[PDB]
Amino acid sequence: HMPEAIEVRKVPLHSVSDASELAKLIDDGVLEADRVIAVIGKTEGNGGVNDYTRIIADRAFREVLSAKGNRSPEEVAEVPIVWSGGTDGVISPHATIFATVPADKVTKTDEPRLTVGVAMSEQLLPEDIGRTAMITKVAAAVKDAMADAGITDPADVHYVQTKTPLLTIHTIRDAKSRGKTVWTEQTHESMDLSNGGTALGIAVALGEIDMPTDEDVMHSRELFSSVASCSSGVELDRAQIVVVGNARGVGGRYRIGHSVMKDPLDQDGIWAAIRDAGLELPERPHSSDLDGQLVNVFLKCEASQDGTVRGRRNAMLDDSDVHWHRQIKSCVGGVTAAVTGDPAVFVSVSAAHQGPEGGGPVAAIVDLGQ
Amino acid sequence: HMPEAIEVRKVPLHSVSDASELAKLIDDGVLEADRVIAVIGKTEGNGGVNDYTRIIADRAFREVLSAKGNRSPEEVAEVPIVWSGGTDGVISPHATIFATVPADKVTKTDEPRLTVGVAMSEQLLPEDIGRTAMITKVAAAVKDAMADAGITDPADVHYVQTKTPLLTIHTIRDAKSRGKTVWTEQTHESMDLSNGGTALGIAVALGEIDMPTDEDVMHSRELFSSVASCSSGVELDRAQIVVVGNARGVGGRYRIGHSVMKDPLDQDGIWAAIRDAGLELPERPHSSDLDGQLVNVFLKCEASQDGTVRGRRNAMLDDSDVHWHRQIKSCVGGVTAAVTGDPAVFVSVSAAHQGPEGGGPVAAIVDLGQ
Amino acid sequence: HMPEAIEVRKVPLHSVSDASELAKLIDDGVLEADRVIAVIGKTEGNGGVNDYTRIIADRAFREVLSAKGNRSPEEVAEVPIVWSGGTDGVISPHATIFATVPADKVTKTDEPRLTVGVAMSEQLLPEDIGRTAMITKVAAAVKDAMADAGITDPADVHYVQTKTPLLTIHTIRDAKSRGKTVWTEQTHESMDLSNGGTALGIAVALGEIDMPTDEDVMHSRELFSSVASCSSGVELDRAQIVVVGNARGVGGRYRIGHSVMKDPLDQDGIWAAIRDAGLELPERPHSSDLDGQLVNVFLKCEASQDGTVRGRRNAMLDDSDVHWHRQIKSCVGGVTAAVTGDPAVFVSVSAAHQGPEGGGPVAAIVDLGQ
Amino acid sequence: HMPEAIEVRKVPLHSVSDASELAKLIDDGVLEADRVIAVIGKTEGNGGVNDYTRIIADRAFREVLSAKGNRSPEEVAEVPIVWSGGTDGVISPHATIFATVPADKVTKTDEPRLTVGVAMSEQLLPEDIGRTAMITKVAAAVKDAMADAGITDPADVHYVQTKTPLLTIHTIRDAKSRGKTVWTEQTHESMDLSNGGTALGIAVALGEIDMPTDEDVMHSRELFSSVASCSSGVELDRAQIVVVGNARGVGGRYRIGHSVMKDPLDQDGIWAAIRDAGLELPERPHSSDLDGQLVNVFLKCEASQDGTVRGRRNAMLDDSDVHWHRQIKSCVGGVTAAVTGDPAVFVSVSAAHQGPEGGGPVAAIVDLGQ
Ligand SMILES: NC(=O)CN(CC(=O)O)CC(=O)O
Ligand SMILES: NC(=O)CN(CC(=O)O)CC(=O)O
Ligand SMILES: NC(=O)CN(CC(=O)O)CC(=O)O
Ligand SMILES: NC(=O)CN(CC(=O)O)CC(=O)O
Ligand SMILES: [Mg+2]
Ligand SMILES: [Mg+2]
Ligand SMILES: [Mg+2]
Ligand SMILES: [Mg+2]
Secondary structure, three states: OOOOOEEEEEEEOOOOOOOHHHHHHHHOOOOOHHHEEEEEEEEOOOOOOOOOHHHHHHHHHHHHHHHOOOOOHHHHHOOOEEEEEOOOOOOOOEEEEEEEOOHHHOOOOOOEEEEEEEEEEEEOOHHHOOOHHHHHHHHHHHHHHHHHOOOOOHHHEEEEEEEEOOOOHHHHHHHHHOOOOOOOOOHHHHHHHHHHHHHHHHHHHOOOOOOOOHHHOOOOOOOOEOOEEEEEOOOOOEEEEEEEEEEEOOOOOEEEEEEEEOOOOOHHHHHHHHHHOOOOOOOOOOHHHOOOOEEEEEEEEOOOOOOEEOOEEOOHHHOOOOOHHHHHHHHHHHHHHHHHOOOOOEEEEOOOOEOOOOOEEEEEEEEOOO | OOOOOEEEEEEEOOOOOOOHHHHHHHHOOOOOHHHEEEEEEEEOOOOOOOOOHHHHHHHHHHHHHHHOOOOOHHHHHOOOEEEEEOOOOOOOOEEEEEEEOOHHHOOOOOOEEEEEEEEEEEEOOHHHOOOHHHHHHHHHHHHHHHHHOOOOOHHHEEEEEEEEOOOOHHHHHHHHHOOOOOOOOOHHHHHHHHHHHHHHHHHHHOOOOOOOOHHHOOOOOOOOEOOEEEEEOOOOOEEEEEEEEEEEOOOOOEEEEEEEEOOOOOHHHHHHHHHHOOOOOOOOOOHHHOOOOEEEEEEEEOOOOOOEEOOEEOOHHHOOOOOHHHHHHHHHHHHHHHHHOOOOOEEEEOOOOEOOOOOEEEEEEEEOOO | OOOOOEEEEEEEOOOOOOOHHHHHHHHOOOOOHHHEEEEEEEEOOOOOOOOOHHHHHHHHHHHHHHHOOOOOHHHHHOOOEEEEEOOOOOOOOEEEEEEEOOHHHOOOOOOEEEEEEEEEEEEOOHHHOOOHHHHHHHHHHHHHHHHHOOOOOHHHEEEEEEEEOOOOHHHHHHHHHOOOOOOOOOHHHHHHHHHHHHHHHHHHHOOOOOOOOHHHOOOOOOOOEOOEEEEEOOOOOEEEEEEEEEEEOOOOOEEEEEEEEOOOOOHHHHHHHHHHOOOOOOOOOOHHHOOOOEEEEEEEEOOOOOOEEOOEEOOHHHOOOOOHHHHHHHHHHHHHHHHHOOOOOEEEEOOOOEOOOOOEEEEEEEEOOO | OOOOOEEEEEEEOOOOOOOHHHHHHHHOOOOOHHHEEEEEEEEOOOOOOOOOHHHHHHHHHHHHHHHOOOOOHHHHHOOOEEEEEOOOOOOOOEEEEEEEOOHHHOOOOOOEEEEEEEEEEEEOOHHHOOOHHHHHHHHHHHHHHHHHOOOOOHHHEEEEEEEEOOOOHHHHHHHHHOOOOOOOOOHHHHHHHHHHHHHHHHHHHOOOOOOOOHHHOOOOOOOOEOOEEEEEOOOOOEEEEEEEEEEEOOOOOEEEEEEEEOOOOOHHHHHHHHHHOOOOOOOOOOHHHOOOOEEEEEEEEOOOOOOEEOOEEOOHHHOOOOOHHHHHHHHHHHHHHHHHOOOOOEEEEOOOOEOOOOOEEEEEEEEOOO
């Protein structure tokens, strides 16, 4: 329960089943396998429903964690690992690894430094998905995780990465066998609904919004969290919550900060996250100012329902050829990598209630040590 | 033959068949229909072979030019109009209109101001496409156009927008009936080949490279033009050349400049084009510095054959789901619109021999008047 | 109001903007432009939202009808013309033209022969779409059209081709300005909802089902019409109904029949439609038995929500790369063209409440004359 | 070297990583793991370059073969397993398993019964791919495999399933380091080239054609094998050949036959393969005649370069949205499954020199036992 200092490393994936850079970090003593508490990565699949790159990476990474540690494959299975597929354009497949640091390697400081808390919610039934029961169950797990990270002020929470169930053929039918209804009968739509409801639960937990109603979900886009990054996948019947923020008195060399991207072109929002994280930059920063101190950024993007960016129409929402999810991801990947100078960026789509409409939250993790 | 001063206006398309903003410019006396000499735009189709948005726009625009002028529909048919389809991500459909200015509306100056020259090459036979016969025929038409713009120094050419034939079922077979071979038998590939060969012809005309050989085409990517922007489409059996540069002693309020984007994230390359065009900007510019003085940028993009950007792997070239053409366009659309602050940007793909590999030329047109 | 004898001709489109075969039929005296009462065709676009091939064909065909007749372009605009885009696989672009026959060219018979009735429903408001108000307004227009065709027994209705509104940004917002809700906020989904609600209205009008409830729409797939073929498109704020059946005492040389395809592979269902239309065939027919007597077939297809065909799983519903609409269309295009021997077949997708789940209605028009 | 009797079983895949039906066949004593000599299956990925479903299935199947047998994972790695991805439309993921039968389970007969031979070619260098060196190396390995199956008359070869290298970034560059050229620089194209050259090598080995020249490859489509089914994938630097035919004096209960599909709608070609395999059927067969005696069919399909089927134009080759590979696969999947009544059919694309243009070979394996 007490927070520990964190080591965080961003590593490339050299192929779909590659975990060799994790293995290397362990071999070289940078981190200990059994101390890996979360992994959050980008994989090269389509970013849709039938994206099998997520399970390939998952197997490769868990295999390393089981092989190089004393944890059993069962214990290793409980480690939250979130793979956001789809690396359209320049986005480079990668994983960000979070591990606790042994006491004999930390210098405690009163400065804010990175902390991580993890929680699983109560079981999320198909008829919960996208409705206020999901919102309340999420909210309670987010408070659990926040406590687990040592954080009492929501202002010190900067990034809440989640994973929640989808609605499948199997679960839609289970609901129906019990005389329950589901919000939608399509798998694809349910990913966006699942993320959106979860986001609302985050927003409620952190005091960003009042408890909303069922009719708000997917509709009242003015209600949102400024720190939620939600993902979904068949593997669970609960929400997995990873809270990332800062705490004082922990030590460590990393710090997290955040802002929002107001729209897909809002580079200044990204720079604002980096400054918030504690890097001192010029008034007009450039990627060349970073000198290896930016570990990663994590952000959400979306096409707004109004079909416009900076007053100009685009055709993303009507495009039956290439889903707007993939279009906007590629676009924002560029806008983001142009700030960071590094195409290994965590850029995710499906952003309902995650940041303002047409935008998204952005978190930055920086290295403030020697 | 003598150059005239140019008025250039960028207008949105509000729908696929909309030319109302052109009609408005004519009604309001900004330009005269019969003085429109070129149009270069972005349309909302797929950007591929079966993109019928190009012909829809074409009809809409030519209808206005015929209705509001004294030119016959035949004369109006000779006006070069280039539609680059595919507006992935935020890119906004639009057209940039170039028109000559009556003598009683120009103040002649020795400063460099925008000039346009136009030429059609000799007939380009199917077995010419992608080979040195195309290169030589292009080169001669580019010299013709350069002369037509009043430009003697290639250093004053900043943007050469072209349109060249594709290879179709019909033409591949014509070649064969005469006992000729073609470079490739696939329509899709032939668009990229056609643009690449044309680019080489531009590079030869301007002294950027020595005359290459057949085996160089599509292969020697170190050979390229820094001003070529080439497009292709079934409508022609000749190359249409639009040379855009500057000349002194013409007058007008617009000026063009250029640079190259070294890779997809090279915002500084875009800013370099804008400075070259004559806008004085801060050392680290931001879009908010532009205050309506940037008319448009025109640039090419591509995924490099090495599969990497700033040393990080991406999976664009292996992606059988969404062609890398569309991925990179969306990405670079974002990177570009982030510089200009305006999603109406001319961003095109198919860049062989147009700028360095993985990059492309970028031209900027700025308004230096009151 | 009284029914007339019908001439029906299926013509290819040689390109996206080609109506030359219609022009030819008129020039050769096969039919009169002013007597064309409906056109139903397949166009080569993507079959999705951003399919601009439908408007191209529409313009080309209406231009012929206005040029070669005495009807004004306004009157010609009232002719129902339905374009179902997406010709995946072998499906060949084409149009089926229905025209009335002058009295001096008909031999009246008591045999059932083809008749067509047309109606427009009351205005369909955005909050009607997919709900019982749509169902009732449709139902009344279907009764209107049935009467217009001279049909009193629903058993003589074999094919009801419709066109209904979609929900757009504009209409979703109009609803909201009046304090109304809409069934869904996504354009793509609303096409399927619009067709499904319309189908239910057809089923109610013909006595195939009892009046359903709002919650049935898109959900109770056991409720369906065996003759409905519904399509949607922004051009209208009403439903356009084309009823095609038979009546006795009219004359003419064509007759229509129908059945259902129980699943995507149900060739026997197609053969059953052809027999029902009045062609005498062997017990096990083959395409070579048809000898030019099959004008066309018109049918719907879909992937079932259970993810299976003849007890075998497929992955259509999870496929984020190529929408199942396009997969199933291509599949059923083959299965269908294999029966008819002619790839010009009207195969459409979006089949909720149109035929049993995983299947669809199929109608056949045959030539029983000399 | 001497041929053995063969047991062949077609099993579904219930998910991407499922080999449970293979495991079940082994547990139930139907076949022995160590006697599995080839597996040929369909997987649910995109059927393109970035199809990771093939490696998932591969791992799942080899894991079973290693776990349930005495072969080492190294020996199990030598078993030819060919996964053809892309199950567009109704096609159901599945694997066909071939195993030898112990002598105490066979009744020797002079009737033709199924035999399998396997060979690996000499190393295939990048500059071999698509050229006559590939053709000769293939041809020799096909003769090797034919001998390994006990077949001296090519007329007894009915299906030759292969796997050959692609050209990658890595291999294209290796070629270049040795001062060699490659046929094409694009991975996607090289899959089709690789299959086409291999097919030609099969055709040469079996006496179907004379040795062709480099310029014939991909161009002279009148040259083809009537039994070749070629696939490609990064895993090899040699061709893997699986010859399937019949031999007399072996015994077993299965027999193979073949024909060709002349075009995508040629159901009679499929029925001809089934008859050739030895099933007695009515003059006009129907799927209901099969009564469980059809194990599987294996066939190739393609869009012809002339853009037509049974004299009607389609738009497959110009479609930049959904590649014609996927369109034609879905179409032919339907046409095929309609014959077999079973959506688990091996339908593959990339058919240059495999069957006539616009068509493909089709082989059928039937169970003639009790
Ligand atoms: N809900 C999700 O996981 C959305 N994912 C889906 C996927 O990862 O395949 C896309 C993304 O994260 O950008
Ligand atoms: N060769 C071309 O015209 C390439 N075009 C093709 C098209 O416009 O549809 C894509 C682009 O210009 O970005
Ligand atoms: N609702 C529709 O019109 C469905 N359409 C959409 C389209 O035609 O673009 C697809 C089809 O008819 O097969
Ligand atoms: N060359 C190949 O393996 C072609 N494959 C590619 C793949 O399996 O992903 C498609 C098919 O076999 O139908
Ligand atoms: Mg948002
Ligand atoms: Mg380039
Ligand atoms: Mg149905
Ligand atoms: Mg073939």
